[PDB]
Amino acid sequence: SLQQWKVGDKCSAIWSEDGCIYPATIASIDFKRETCVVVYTGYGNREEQNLSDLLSPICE
Ligand SMILES: Cc1cc(=N)c2ccccc2n1C
Ligand SMILES: Cc1cc(=N)c2ccccc2n1C
């Protein structure tokens, strides 16, 4: 990908606990590890995602 994900980007992510997709924002990126932390919109919980697993915001 030419464009890089950055902190503050809106995305969708698969929640580890149920396998369903939810809207999220990137809070941090580990440039070497190609991982990030996402904050789930409305729930407010956060968890690690590989950058390669982030989706553009669903149904937007
Ligand atoms: C029920 C529920 C509880 C959560 N704490 C949560 C967090 C992040 C994304 C989805 C989530 N859902 C669906
Ligand atoms: C739908 C979509 C897919 C992409 N891979 C992407 C990449 C970079 C910027 C916008 C993007 N959008 C909007």
Numbering used by the authors: 88 to 147
Paper text:
Survival of motor neuron (SMN) functions in diverse biological pathways via recognition of symmetric dimethylarginine (Rme2s) on proteins by its Tudor domain, and deficiency of SMN leads to spinal muscular atrophy. Here we report a potent and selective antagonist with a 4-iminopyridine scaffold targeting the Tudor domain of SMN. In order to understand the structural basis of compound 1 recognition by these reader proteins, we determined the crystal structures of compound 1 in complex with SMN, TDRD3 and UHRF1, respectively.
None of the single-ring compounds bound to SMN, which may not be able to provide strong enough π–π stacking interaction to hold the compounds.
